[PDB]
UniProtKB/Swiss-Prot annotation, chain B:
Name of the protein: 26S proteasome regulatory subunit 6B
Gene name tied to this protein: Psmc4
Similarity section: Belongs to the AAA ATPase family.
Function noted in UniProt: Component of the 26S proteasome, a multiprotein complex involved in the ATP-dependent degradation of ubiquitinated proteins. This complex plays a key role in the maintenance of protein homeostasis by removing misfolded or damaged proteins, which could impair cellular functions, and by removing proteins whose functions are no longer required. Therefore, the proteasome participates in numerous cellular processes, including cell cycle progression, apoptosis, or DNA damage repair.
Complex formation: Component of the 19S proteasome regulatory particle complex. The 26S proteasome consists of a 20S core particle (CP) and two 19S regulatory subunits (RP). The regulatory particle is made of a lid composed of 9 subunits, a base containing 6 ATPases including PSMC4 and few additional components. Interacts with NR1I3. Interacts with PAAF1. Interacts with TRIM5. Interacts with ZFAND1.
Intracellular or extracellular location(s): Cytoplasm; Nucleus
Curated annotation (Swiss-Prot), chain C:
Family: Belongs to the AAA ATPase family.
Primary localisation category: cytoplasm
Keyword Transferase: no
GO molecular-function terms, A-Z: ATP binding; ATP hydrolysis activity; proteasome-activating activity; TBP-class protein binding
Gene Ontology CC: cytoplasm; membrane; nucleus; proteasome accessory complex; proteasome complex; proteasome regulatory particle; proteasome regulatory particle, base subcomplex
Gene: Psmc1
Stated role: Component of the 26S proteasome, a multiprotein complex involved in the ATP-dependent degradation of ubiquitinated proteins. This complex plays a key role in the maintenance of protein homeostasis by removing misfolded or damaged proteins, which could impair cellular functions, and by removing proteins whose functions are no longer required. Therefore, the proteasome participates in numerous cellular processes, including cell cycle progression, apoptosis, or DNA damage repair.
Name the UniProt record assigns to this protein: 26S proteasome regulatory subunit 4
Organism: Rattus norvegicus
Biological-process GO terms, alphabetical: proteasome-mediated ubiquitin-dependent protein catabolic process
Feature: compositional bias, Basic and acidic residues: 31-48
UniProtKB/Swiss-Prot annotation, chain E:
Tissues and organs where the protein is expressed, per its UniProt entry: Ubiquitous.
Native organism: Rattus norvegicus (Rat)
Entries under PROSITE patterns matching the protein: PROTEASOME_ALPHA_1, PROTEASOME_ALPHA_2
Modified positions (Phosphotyrosine) in chain numbering: Y159
Highest classification ranks of the organism: Eukaryota, Metazoa, Chordata, Craniata, Vertebrata
Description of how the protein assembles with itself and partners: The 26S proteasome consists of a 20S proteasome core and two 19S regulatory subunits. The 20S proteasome core is a barrel-shaped complex made of 28 subunits that are arranged in four stacked rings. The two outer rings are each formed by seven alpha subunits, and the two inner rings are formed by seven beta subunits. The proteolytic activity is exerted by three beta-subunits PSMB5, PSMB6 and PSMB7. PSMA7 interacts directly with the PSMG1-PSMG2 heterodimer which promotes 20S proteasome assembly. Interacts with HIF1A. Interacts with RAB7A. Interacts with PRKN. Interacts with ABL1 and ABL2.
Name of the molecule in the record: Proteasome subunit alpha type-7
Entry-annotated residues carrying N6-acetyllysine: K233
Swiss-Prot record, chain J:
Function: Component of the 20S core proteasome complex involved in the proteolytic degradation of most intracellular proteins. This complex plays numerous essential roles within the cell by associating with different regulatory particles. Associated with two 19S regulatory particles, forms the 26S proteasome and thus participates in the ATP-dependent degradation of ubiquitinated proteins.
A Pfam family it matches: Proteasome
GO biological process: proteasome-mediated ubiquitin-dependent protein catabolic process
Name recorded for this polypeptide: Proteasome subunit alpha type-5
Length: 50, 70, 385, 101, 246, 51, 396, 221, 249, 233
């Protein structure tokens, strides 16, 4: 779910930059943003979804 | 009779929901605040793609809000 | 032999003969049934009309009326009209009523509910008596209660004793309380009702004693019948937290079993098979004698015996004799019949996986290995002594 | 997860697709399939995926009473689901815990 | 102590629950047979569940209470050895045997130990928040006389002397086969008495010499627990005798 | 004033519909003006967490 | 061979032709008559039909008004939940009318032709009840003093009211059967009811309580009322252990449903109206559960313990059981009785049963003393652990 | 004038009898109300039932409402996060409303009988829902002799036997029981052949109504 | 009040087991691998070290390898909580015996003193039994090298090779397959123990943070109790790991 | 739930009513006081010949001139007998002569009912014993037979029976046994009554008799003596 979250987060970045193609830059920011969600999952010792 | 109506209403709603994909329309947006007085059937994906999270605000986030009301 | 055959031919003829003789001859006669009787039937069809409102006969009352609740969501007070017999009809049947004036024209409808369908689960065992290895005698004591009054009721009635009903299958589980229930059912060739005990405790309140009453009704008509209640223990220990019935609901349901068994109303030739892992967690009255007559303990099948059952198992999952038959048996020390199945069932899966139709030695070793994770082999009993 | 696929594929998919293969070989048809393992291993998704692969319906019992009209509840609904599954055969009946409700 | 919560309370059935729960746990398994000879008494247990990787030398399921008193025990379940439960009865009985020999200059008799088992079970009954052990012990030994004795106790605490008895996995079945084997020659010849124990154990389930452990006592001399290697030789010779009579 | 419920009778079910309606009417997208709505209770604990 | 083959094919073939006759004559749809009692039953119903009774929709009188149209006017509410203002017919005689009771009104012109019979509001309770069957005293175990004591209470006042009135003492209503199971509390209740020859209503404690709160109040209320109106009723409230329990609430459902039946029985009994023509018999294994209201007299005049019998009594259960059997009388009834003391009525019948099990295996038609001896020593040792009595007797 | 008065304390103290007496003194209607009838099988209709029952008492004239077993209507300590019924909650609240002076409470009086006040919640009890709190202790020694004095009149008795002596022996009796002991003694009396009850019949009478199952001689002495 | 709360878990069951010992039996199985193998010059224990982080103090010798005496050592399968009180008590008993007898204590003598206490809890008192099952390894004069196992009521059994904990059936069968009654030396004996731990454990290459192995070896007539250090353990891992590599081929 | 300690509305304790039943479960013992001496007879009722019949005992000595037959749970009685042995010799140290049937019986009976299931000392009973003892001997005063109950009611008897046949046998003794019946006739009376509760006929391996007669100490009857009473029943 987290892995797919990388592509999905990437799209938000492509709009923001105002690109038409999801560049490498979009992906750099996405891994780090997804890593913060993971960290939250682990802290809570329960899933995020409810 | 009461319990059955509400159940029927919801089935019709799921059926019509699925109808949106063929056309430009964006689907139902609903809030679950208590999820235990809600069916887990209604939280299943395949009609949901995006799920929004809200958490509790932290300190800094909270402060901003407090200025707007005052 | 000859006297019996002639008697049967005559009996069949007399019902036919008499019924018929009076009718056709009275059609010739100038005053009796004749025209009237044929007309009377025609007259029921015309009076009823179409449509017909359906009802269910709760009870008949001897006052020239009956209580039939009509399918319209209100109750009706019907009268014996449109040519019908009050006493002829037996309770619980669906009946046809003339709408125009409420009358029961007749009975033919049942309009079948799904509740009876869930109850009736017919038999067709995996393994059954006379393909099971060792402790031949242990099965034979069970038969005393279940099988033997079905096979020959004669011995019991002539002796003059209360016909044995009810058994408790107890002991540590691994002996096949489930297997024995299926096995007796095939052999007897009587109706098999299977209701799991967990099913009695429902998410509804107070439905549980009602569900017992129905179970036993469905058994009586079917009878000679066997009822296997798998695992009576489950309802008493557990609180599922799907009801607010609590301890009270279990208590009322257990009681309803007693009433239906002997009680004020008995149910004819329904035996009960209670598998249970334990006898000290169960309700006191439920396990009292005279709701059971036969009490039997199953101790685990012997290490030599595991071997005689295995040949059969290996042959069923294609015969190989290249297997280390002895090693698989040995490590496991006196535990479940279930493990022998697991080792053959898995091995055959593995063989297929490898892409062959023959189970080999390597496949038997592999399956064994997977089975030790899943269970604990027989390593518990070893540690203590 | 190369390991995971071979194990699930044998148990569930081969008998529903063809019981005949199992029957010739002499294996007993699978009764229970137990899924266990830590959360976040694609166990829920894999169940759904398996249904698509066999071309079998996925009948999920979610524990809703919104879903139930068969008798309006499901914990004495054992056989009524089995009858209807046989009609719209093959099927895989799924029981799920989301661990939140 | 603070614990006084009920575990035993009297029944209108005229019994104590624990005692009866224990008695069935010796019905269902752990074959222990004893025969009494004319110089020597031998007791045997079958199962230490030697799965061919376990130790046989140091494991004791027959414990010497004294040097002229020994007991072999049984009661089983899913928790198969109740060695622990036995181990208490064994330690208290061990001191008591020795103690009796300090005070009273006669070597302690089996009859003293049997009354002592009847009182231990009972004492545990009367005390608040306490429960009877599940054990049944075949108390073997020598008196003042030097006469060999075999006595058997039950989980209630009632004792009888018996020439030969079998308990476990059908107490009466093993004993009625064994009843033919108890003859005047068998009791006289010491060597035949060792075979009688082994010969009974074999009826329930046959073979194994490692599963079978038996301990022998001769006169007031100390307990000798026999090697499994001695047992294997003996089961082989017993199996041929069965073919000879029959 | 309702609670989480969801293992109850038909009587616990009807209370929730009414309780839902009040929430939206107050603050939802609809709101009062000069006109004031007064509630009376015996326990504030019987009340729905959302309320 | 030939003659029989011929007759089979022919008879069957005749039923097909006969099919028009099968339906009218025998029944099974389209006339279910034999026209000896239906000619009478139909005839009387017809006059009703013709005017305004049938279709008769069940309704009930909510209130007696005198407003709108005639001086007799009633507001009846039908079981579709609409009210109607109706008239009253003398066209055929109303016979069972009471406010709140079911009454019948017509759908063509809504007027009361005939009221429905007294308090048939639960149809559910009435169907299950047996009415006074015959149970022989060759299976109601023992002679015993225990049997005799209940009879004075239950049987004598109903059989003869003559005596009680003459002295000027009030007649029995109440008896409490309490003691552990398998002592035949149910078994005796049935036997004496037929002996007396008064109407028998057995009812299960579990059936009183049903899903909704206050649904349980409808069945009990109406059962006690129905009982009073008929001539001589005995309501045998059967086996309430936790279906009778003391008033409390847990805030999840509570004891509410259970106490509901209980409380309903209290309100009509003591009430502002006393118990009508209703006798009550209670079977409990736990008086520990019951409410202080039930335990005091006015429905529990005398407490009698029918519990485990005495040493002499166990011998008498053997003798009564032997009469039912066709086993030897050369088997000493006494020997069995001494060998298993502290045994309930149920256990002594299992001994006979067991004796028979050994007997069938051997392939004997008659039980032996050998089978018997064995059966008691297994009963004293094994059966004791399972038995109901240690826990139920502590409550009793 | 009282909103309602309360009677609480152990059964068998003659509350039902006392109710019948109240009714005769006032010359008014005692409107029988059962606490279980008010909660009903129909939902939300059950609440309408409480409104109607008090509503009618006003219309009938001034009335006294005899309510039996108010423990059925509800006990409000609610926080019940899971269910908790609440046909019962609606009726418990509606009952307060009718006692409140939106409608009179000087026209409707409530004679309430409940076995305990422990079971009951303070919302109901107050001092302006139920004004008097009258406890009913189990009869005194003299009280049981008076209870038998009425009873004695119905049958026939000796003047060598009274209740007062039996009251002195043991205090393990109640008013319902005192009736039962007189009725019990009469069965034996009748069985013998007598046109009375005597001291022998009563003395046996107390022993018989209480169960035995093996009795005593040298089991206790 | 008090009996009602008492779940009557101290009661005997008809079958002849104690409910508590059986529930304790499960507590041992959740928990990690502890195995002991007999060898002919020494004896070795291998236990799962479950304390892996990169910030570890190591204030103890080990949190599962306990030296009970100056001639005994033990390993743990079960709960750390029970293990800590118990481990101390095991020390007073081992040490007092050493004072009186002055010779190494039998492994059998060591399980029995504790057993009384275990049994006491279960039968009566309503006290939990200890959640650990201990594998004691030692050399005593009388038998030579020995290994003893104790269970939650103090049920004892002398074993040449035994294993309790996680994948107890798998470890004991495997070890049964290669080795049957004392066919190997001290060198080879460490290599099997780590191999078994390797398969049972989720990490399939191990390190010295994952395993901790302790040896008890009889040198110059006196029992030496040593917890091996991380350095020695890596050597043993490479020896088994390499042996596994050949197996495949 | 309810406790067991409670008094019932019958007016008796639950634990004690159960204990009387426990007496009824076991084997029958007859103790007859004759003025020629006191005989105690008990049924062995053996089911196996592998048993050694000497060591099935149910007559145990309180004293060296008082014998005791016990009934109900054999084990439960044995403890009471163990405490009794210590008192009789103890009595010899203090008084300087041997204990009487009366003195010993009242002292054991105090212990019989003491029961407090919770919040009572572990050196005191949680439940009463279900044993009835029959103490039969001839002492300084003369032949005395005292009967002890599990209810802790002691009473003096001349003929008492306890065990499964307890009510039946006790009635039947009152009939045959009187004080116009001699000691040997008491032995014949007991043997007949014994048979209904027994599974077989009377034999010298199926009875154990011991008589304590004036001027003599306790004698356990030998096989010859058992056989002389068997011949004529």
């Amino acid at each position: 779910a987290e892995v797919k979250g990388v592509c999905t987060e990437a799209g938000m970045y492509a709009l923001r930059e105002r690109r038409v193609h999801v560049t490498q830059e979009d992906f750099e920011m996405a891994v780090a943003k997804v890593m913060q969600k993971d960290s939250e999952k682990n802290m809570s010792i329960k899933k995020l979804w409810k | 009779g009461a319990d059955r109506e509400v159940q029927r209403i919801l089935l019709e709603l799921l059926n019509q929901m699925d109808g949106f994909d063929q056309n430009v329309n964006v689907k139902v947006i609903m809030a679950t605040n208590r999820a235990d007085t809600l069916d887990p059937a209604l939280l299943r994906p395949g009609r949901l793609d995006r799920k929004i999270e809200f958490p509790l605000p932290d300190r800094r986030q909270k402060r901003l809000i407090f200025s707007t009301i005052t | 032999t000859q006297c019996r055959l002639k008697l049967l031919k005559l009996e069949r003829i007399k019902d036919y003969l008499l019924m018929e003789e009076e009718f056709i001859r009275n059609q010739e006669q100038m005053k009796p049934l004749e025209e009237k009787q044929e007309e009377e039937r025609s007259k029921v069809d015309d009076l009823r009309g179409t449509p017909m409102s359906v009802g269910t006969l709760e009870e008949i009352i001897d006052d020239n009326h009956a209580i039939v609740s009509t399918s319209v969501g209100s109750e009706h007070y019907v009268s014996i009209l449109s040519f019908v017999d009050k006493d002829l009809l037996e309770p619980g049947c669906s009946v046809l009523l003339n709408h125009k004036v409420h009358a029961v024209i007749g009975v033919l409808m049942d309009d079948t509910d799904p509740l009876v369908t869930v109850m009736k689960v017919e038999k067709a065992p995996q393994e059954t008596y006379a393909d099971i290895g060792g402790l031949d005698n242990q099965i034979q004591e069970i038969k005393e209660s279940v099988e033997l009054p079905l096979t020959h009721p004669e011995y019991y009635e002539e002796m003059g004793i209360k016909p044995p009903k009810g058994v408790i299958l107890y002991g540590p589980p691994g002996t096949g309380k489930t297997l024995l229930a299926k096995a007796v059912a095939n052999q007897t060739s009587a109706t098999f009702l299977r209701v799991v005990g967990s099913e009695l405790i429902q998410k509804y309140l107070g439905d549980g004693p009602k569900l017992v009453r129905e179970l036993f009704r469905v058994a009586e008509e079917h009878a000679p019948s066997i009822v296997f209640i798998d695992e009576i223990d489950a309802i008493g220990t557990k609180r599922y937290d799907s009801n607010s019935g609590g301890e009270r609901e279990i208590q009322r349901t257990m009681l309803e079993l007693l009433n239906q068994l002997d009680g004020f109303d008995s149910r004819g030739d329904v035996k009960v098979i209670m598998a249970t892992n334990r006898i000290e967690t169960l309700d006191p009255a439920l396990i009292r004698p005279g709701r059971i007559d036969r009490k039997i303990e199953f101790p685990l099948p012997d290490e030599k015996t595991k071997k005689r059952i295995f040949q059969i198992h290996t042959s069923r999952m294609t015969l190989a004799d290249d297997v280390t038959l002895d090693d698989l048996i040995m490590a496991k020390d006196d535990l479940s019949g279930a493990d022998i199945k697991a080792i053959c069932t898995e091995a055959g899966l593995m063989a297929l996986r490898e892409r062959r139709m023959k189970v080999t030695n390597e496949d038997f070793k592999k399956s064994k290995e997977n089975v030790l994770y899943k269970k604990q082999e027989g390593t518990p009993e070893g540690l203590y002594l | 997860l190369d390991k995971q696929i071979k194990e699930i594929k044998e148990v569930i998919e081969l008998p529903v697709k063809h019981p005949e293969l199992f029957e010739a070989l002499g294996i007993a048809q699978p009764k229970g399939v137990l899924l266990y393992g830590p959360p976040g291993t694609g166990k829920t998704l894999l169940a759904r995926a398996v249904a698509h692969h066999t071309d079998c319906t996925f009948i999920r019992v979610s524990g809703s009473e919104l879903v139930q009209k068969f008798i309006g509840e499901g914990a004495r609904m054992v056989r009524e689901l089995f009858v209807m599954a046989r009609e719209h055969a093959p099927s895989i009946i799924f029981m799920d815990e989301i661990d939140s409700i | 102590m603070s614990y006084d919560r009920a575990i035993t309370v009297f029944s209108p059935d005229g019994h104590l629950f624990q005692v009866e729960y224990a008695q069935e746990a010796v019905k269902k398994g752990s074959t222990a047979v004893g025969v009494r000879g004319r110089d020597i008494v031998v007791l045997g247990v079958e199962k230490k569940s030697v799965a061919k990787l376990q130790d046989e030398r140091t494991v004791r399921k027959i414990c010497a209470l004294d040097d002229n008193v020994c007991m072999a025990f049984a009661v089983v379940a899913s928790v198969s050895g109740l060695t622990a439960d036995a181990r208490i009865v064994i330690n208290r009985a061990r001191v008591e045997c020795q103690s009796h020999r300090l005070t009273v200059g006669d070597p302690v008799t089996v009859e003293y130990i049997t009354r002592y088992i009847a009182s231990l079970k009972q004492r545990y009954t009367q005390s608040n928040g306490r429960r009877p052990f599940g054990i049944s012990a075949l108390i073997v030994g020598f008196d003042f006389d030097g006469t060999p004795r075999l006595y058997q106790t039950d989980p209630s605490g009632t004792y009888h002397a018996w020439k030969a008895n079998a308990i476990g996995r059908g107490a009466k079945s093993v004993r009625e086969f064994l009843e033919k084997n108890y003859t005047d020659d068998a009791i006289e010849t010491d060597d035949l008495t060792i075979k009688l124990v082994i010969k009974a154990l074999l009826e329930v389930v046959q073979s194994g010499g490692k599963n079978i452990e038996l301990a022998v006592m001769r006169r007031d001399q100390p307990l000798k627990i026999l090697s499994p290697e001695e047992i294997e030789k003996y089961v082989a010779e017993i199996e041929k005798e069965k073919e000879e009579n029959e | 004033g309702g609670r989480r419920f969801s293992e109850g009778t038909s009587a616990d079910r009807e209370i929730q519909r009414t309780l839902m309606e009040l929430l939206n009417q107050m603050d939802g997208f609809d709101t009062l003006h000069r006109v004031k709505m007064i509630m009376a209770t015996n326990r504030p604990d019987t009340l729905d967490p959302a309320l | 061979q030939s003659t029989y083959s011929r007759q089979i094919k022919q008879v069957e073939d005749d039923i097909q032709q006969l099919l028009k006759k099968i339906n009218e004559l025998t029944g099974i749809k389209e006339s279910d008559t034999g026209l000896a009692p239906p000619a009478l039953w139909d005839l009387a119903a017809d006059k009703q039909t013709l005017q305004s009774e049938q279709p008769l929709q069940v309704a009930r009188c909510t209130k007696i008004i005198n407003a709108d149209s005639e001086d007799p006017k009633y507001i009846i509410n039908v079981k579709q939940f609409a009210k109607f203002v109706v008239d009253l017919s003398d066209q055929v005689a109303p016979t069972d009318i009471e406010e709140g009771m079911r009454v019948g009104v017509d759908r063509n012109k809504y007027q009361i032709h005939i009221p429905l019979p007294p308090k048939i509001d639960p149809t559910v309770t009435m169907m299950q009840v047996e009415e006074k069957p015959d149970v022989t005293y060759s299976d109601v175990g023992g002679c015993k003093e225990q049997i005799e004591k209940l009879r004075e209470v239950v049987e004598t006042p109903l059989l003869h009211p003559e005596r009680f009135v003459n002295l000027g003492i009030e007649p029995p209503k109440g008896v409490l059967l309490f003691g552990p199971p398998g002592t035949g509390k149910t078994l005796c209740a049935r036997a004496v009811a037929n002996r007396t020859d008064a109407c028998f209503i057995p009812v299960i404690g579990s059936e009183l309580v049903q899903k909704y709160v206050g649904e349980g109040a409808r069945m009990v209320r109406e059962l006690f009322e129905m009982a009073r109106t008929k001539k001589a009723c005995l309501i045998f409230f059967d086996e309430i252990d936790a279906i009778g329990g003391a008033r409390f609430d847990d805030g999840a459902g509570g004891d509410n449903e259970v106490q509901r039946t209980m409380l309903e029985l209290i309100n009509q009994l003591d009430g502002f109206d006393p118990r009508g023509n209703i006798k009550v018999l209670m079977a409990t294994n736990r008086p520990d559960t019951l409410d202080p209201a039930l335990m005091r007299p006015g429905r529990l005049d005398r407490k009698i313990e029918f519990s485990l019998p005495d040493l002499e009594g166990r011998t008498h259960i053997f003798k009564i059981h032997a009469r039912s059997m066709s086993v030897e009388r050369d088997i000493r009834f006494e020997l069995l009785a001494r060998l298993c003391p502290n045994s309930t009525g149920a256990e002594i019948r299992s001994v006979c049963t067991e004796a028979g099990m050994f007997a069938i295996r051997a392939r004997r038609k008659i039980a032996t003393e050998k089978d018997f001896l064995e059966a008691v020593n297994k009963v004293i040792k094994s059966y004791a652990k399972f038995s109901a009595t240690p826990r139920y007797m502590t409550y009793n | 004038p009282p909103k309602g008065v309360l009677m609480y304390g152990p059964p068998g103290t003659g509350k039902t009898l006392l109710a019948r007496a109240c009714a005769a003194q006032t010359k008014a209607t005692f409107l029988k109300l059962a606490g279980p009838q008010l909660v009903q099988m129909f939902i939300g209709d059950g609440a309408k039932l409480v409104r109607d029952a008090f509503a009618l008492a006003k219309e009938k004239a001034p009335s006294i409402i005899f309510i039996d077993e108010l423990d059925a209507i509800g006990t409000k300590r609610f926080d019940s996060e899971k269910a908790g019924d609440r046909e019962v909650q609606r009726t418990m609240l509606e009952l307060l409303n009718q006692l409140d002076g939106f409608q009179p409470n000087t026209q409707v009086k409530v004679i309430a009988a409940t076995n305990r006040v422990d079971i009951l919640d303070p919302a109901l009890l107050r001092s302006g829902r139920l004004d008097r709190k009258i406890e009913f202790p189990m009869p005194n020694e003299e009280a049981r002799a008076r209870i038998m004095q009425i009873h004695s009149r119905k049958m026939n008795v000796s003047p060598d036997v009274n209740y007062e002596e039996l009251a002195r022996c043991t205090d393990d009796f109640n008013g319902a029981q005192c009736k039962a002991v007189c009725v019990e003694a009469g069965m034996i009396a009748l069985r013998r052949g007598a046109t009375e009850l005597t001291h022998e019949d009563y003395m046996e009478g107390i022993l018989e109504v209480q169960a035995k199952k093996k009795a005593n001689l040298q089991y206790y002495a | 009040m008090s009996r009602r709360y008492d779940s009557r878990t101290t009661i005997f069951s008809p079958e002849g087991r104690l409910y508590q010992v059986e529930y304790a039996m499960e507590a041992i199985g959740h928990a990690g691998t502890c195995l002991g193998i007999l060898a002919n010059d020494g004896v070795l224990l291998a236990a799962e070290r479950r304390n892996i982080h990169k910030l570890l103090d190591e204030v103890f010798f080990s949190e599962k390898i306990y030296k009970l005496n100056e001639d005994m050592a033990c390993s743990v399968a079960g709960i750390t909580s029970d293990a800590n009180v118990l481990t101390n008590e095991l020390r007073l008993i081992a040490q007092r015996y050493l004072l009186q007898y002055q010779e190494p204590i039998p492994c059998e003598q060591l399980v029995t003193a504790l057993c009384d206490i275990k049994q006491a809890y279960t039968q009566f008192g309503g006290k939990r039994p200890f959640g650990v099952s201990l594998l004691y390894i030692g050399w005593d004069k009388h038998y030579g090298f020995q290994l003893y196992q104790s269970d939650p009521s103090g049920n004892y059994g002398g074993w040449k090779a035994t294993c309790i904990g996680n994948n107890s059936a798998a470890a004991v069968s495997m070890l049964k397959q290669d080795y049957k009654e004392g066919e190997m030396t001290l060198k080879s004996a460490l290599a099997l123990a780590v191999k078994v731990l390797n398969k049972t454990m989720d990490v399939s290459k191990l390190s010295a943070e994952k395993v901790e192995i302790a040896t008890l070896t009889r040198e110059n007539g006196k029992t030496v109790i040593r917890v091996l250090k991380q350095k020695e353990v890596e050597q043993l891992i490479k020896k088994h790991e390499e042996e596994e590599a050949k197996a495949e081929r | 739930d309810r406790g067991v300690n409670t008094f019932s509305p019958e007016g008796r304790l639950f634990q004690v009513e159960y204990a009387i039943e426990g007496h009824k479960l076991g084997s029958t013992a007859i103790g007859i006081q004759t003025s020629e001496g006191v005989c105690l007879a008990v049924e062995k009722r053996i089911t196996s010949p592998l048993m050694e019949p000497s060591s099935i005992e149910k007559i145990v000595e309180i004293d060296a001139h008082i014998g005791c037959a016990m009934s109900g749970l054999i084990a439960d009685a044995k403890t009471l007998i163990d405490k009794a042995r210590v008192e009789t010799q103890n009595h010899w140290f203090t008084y300087n002569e041997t204990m009487t049937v009366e003195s010993v019986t009242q002292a054991v009976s105090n212990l019989a009912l003491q029961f407090g299931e919770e919040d009572a000392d572990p050196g005191a009973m949680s439940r009463p014993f279900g044993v009835a003892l029959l103490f039969g001997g001839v002492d300084e005063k003369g032949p005395q037979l005292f009967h002890m109950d599990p209810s802790g009611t002691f009473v003096q008897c001349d003929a008492r029976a306890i065990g499964s046949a307890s009510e039946g046998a006790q009635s039947s003794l009152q009939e045959v046994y009187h004080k116009s019946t001699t000691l040997k006739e008491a032995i014949k009376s007991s043997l007949i009554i014994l048979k209904q509760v027994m599974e077989e006929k009377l034999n010298a391996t199926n009875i154990e008799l011991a008589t304590v007669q004036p001027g003599q100490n306790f004698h356990m009857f030998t096989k010859e003596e058992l056989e002389e009473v068997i011949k004529d029943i």
